């Protein structure tokens with residue numbers, strides 16, 4: 162029959178306790194079957210899909226099929242993103258995944274020389290899944306929408322103040338504004 | 346602002362004309378930006394994302410972000426599946442993708458010997474995306490939910506009548522019931 166609760170797309174750290182939920186109107190008098198894409202997850206025949214301690218391997222797209230005698234309904238797709246980061250960044254994050262949007266890894270300030278690789282990282286967790294947008298000197302970096310902002314070979318033109326805008330539709334958080342100096 | 350039309354997950358053949366749609370309440374007085382996962386699709390700044398002649402490379406997960414001055418809303422994820430099949434199976438399918446659920450590639454009847462590889466194929470197109478479930482002698486084959494049903498090395502026990510149940514939530518279509526003989 163019809164679905165009351167659809168699963169949320171979310172970003173979590175590896176090792177954390179994570180659930181994905183699907184609840185029908187007929188609950189508990191319906192059948193549930195979870196899928197990671199077209200793979201029928203074995204023993205994922207319950208309302209909520211539980212990863213006791215997520216692994217990066219677990220990241221991907223999930224859907225839940227709910228049936229009731231005659232019908233069949235597929236839930237919305239849920240994207241599970243699993244980030245592997247050192248313990249040193251897991252401050253203010255326990256072994257249970259929480260929905261709150263929060264930056265775990267912040268960008269860094271660097272003095273590089275022309276020809277260096279510039280690597281900028283911003284890792285956040287939250288539900289709904291966080292989105293990224295990198296900025297340089299108050300302007301958004303066209304198409305820079307990942308945790309990583311990388312420049313293979315820097316010119317002097319790459320100098321400036323950088324930050325990442327992390328956001329969903331419940332919250333947003335700008336990362337530290339970092340300074341990238343390019344000289345010799 | 347709020348979203349009126351969310352994109353549907355769909356399966357299409359390569360070369361076909363395909364659209365993905367997102368429409369907000371504020372239309373046409375809003376901004377649209379499409380994404381293939383976290384990649385900001387360039388020039389996908391319109392209500393509908395158009396693939397004039399899809400390529401397999403195009404398959405994947407898409408979302409549309411709609412903003413209106415203050416707000417931001419992400420649509421539901423859409424799964425685009427692109428199947429590459431010979432022209433000989435494209436009968437009753439033109440160069441424009443249609444929503445109707447229909448089997449293009451059917452399983453085949455075979456007389457194999459113990460140790461053979463048994464390959465069973467069932468390819469369908471439709472919107473919402475079709476789902477598969479293989480059956481043997483009236484019983485569903487536990488966890489066989491892909492276009493392909495493959496057995497690397499057949500025993501005599503693999504003999505029987507097979508078919509694929511293709512389905513979404515608007516329609517379903519059973520494939521030809523095929524006979525698999527295992528002898529010598």
Ligand SMILES: [Cl-]
Pocket residue numbers: 167168169180181182183
């Ligand atoms: Cl959930």
Ligand SMILES: [Cl-]
Pocket residue numbers: 351352353364365366367
């Ligand atoms: Cl659509």
